[PDB]
Amino acid sequence: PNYCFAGKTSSISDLKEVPRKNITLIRGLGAFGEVYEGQVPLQVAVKTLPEVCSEQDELDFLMEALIISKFNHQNIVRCIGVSLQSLPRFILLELMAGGDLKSFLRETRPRPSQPSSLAMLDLLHVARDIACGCQYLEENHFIHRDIAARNCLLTCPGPGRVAKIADFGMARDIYRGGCAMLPVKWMPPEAFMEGIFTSKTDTWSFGVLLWEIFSLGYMPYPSKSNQEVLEFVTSGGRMDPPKNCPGPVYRIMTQCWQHQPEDRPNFAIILERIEYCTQDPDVINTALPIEY
């Protein structure tokens, strides 16, 4: 099977096959398939394909490799290569020691133990990082379909951290699952209703990611089920600001959640507005809540 991105066609032959003897698994790092820290030395993350898998699982794994390998942007996780000619098959990825963004936010919340673990600027930098990645996808006409905190990774826990889009499983499934597994809480009305997807789809999802970020890792639409959210959003309902969220930041969210896709900003505009928030002393001097 071939893969097309940015007007070019690649195949399995285009993937950089790394000799299996050059790859060593160091430690597990935590649904389908496991992820390890590895060495090729170059430190990598290793995603494995279970040997007990269907032919469709194999094609899915291949397509994931093709998709990530063809992106070229600092805010999308790099693919070092693959090891598909030995079993179990490997995809070799940029090692992201900070882990996933949702877990990071939850575990690094300000507490009386760590009163200054995070500040507004840290959150705005994460938002900018992912918005930069989204802008790259948008300008290359790639619709992610699942922009959410769980699908982003951090290079490290500490101050120089960079956030990157990591998981492209939904886009992979669509490129060629069930209702219960659909990320409804991240989807715009035209998406779950008509199955219409555009870049304005990802704009809506990014608004929800922004809420995730500034809530410090809460599940969107607290206390609402998927179907309750669907009816809520379809009726015009929107989330309230996260605790202590600056007005200028919340306004970016609500612009991302405009009912009509044409009324939602593209990512160039979103980046401009995030940048403006980062300049505003009243925004960045706002204290985040301390979780007791």
Chain-centre distance for alpha carbon 35: 17
The answer to the question of whether 239 is labelled as a binding residue is no
Resolution (A): 1.7
- Is 47 labeled as ligand-binding? yes
Q: CATH: 3.30.200.20, 3.40.640.10, 3.40.630.30, 3.40.50.150. Which one for 1-95?
A: 3.30.200.20
Query: What are the residue boundaries of the structural domains of the chain, listed by start?
Result: 1-95, 96-280
Catalytic positions are 146
Residue with tokens 């790259």: 136
Q: Residue 168: which of 187, 153, 189 has the closest Cα?
A: 153
Which residues have C-beta within 8 Å of that of residue 288, sequence separation ≥ 6? 109, 110, 118, 119, 120, 123, 216, 244
Considering the domain 96-280, what is its CATH architecture?
Answer: Orthogonal Bundle (1.10)
Does 120 appear as a known binding residue? no
**β 24-28/79-83 pair status:** unpaired
Q: Are the CB atoms for 236 and 259 separated by under 8 Å?
A: yes
3-state secondary structure 190-249: HHHHHCCCCHHHHHHHHHHHHHHHHCCCCCCCCCCCHHHHHHHHHCCCCCCCCCCCCHHH
In terms of Cα–Cα distance, which of 30, 252, 251 is closest to 131?
252
291 in a known ligand binding site:
no
- Residue 137 corresponds to which tokens in the numbers above? 């996808």
Measured CA to CA in angstroms, residue 149 lies from 74, 126, 130, 154 at distances of: 17, 10, 10, 11
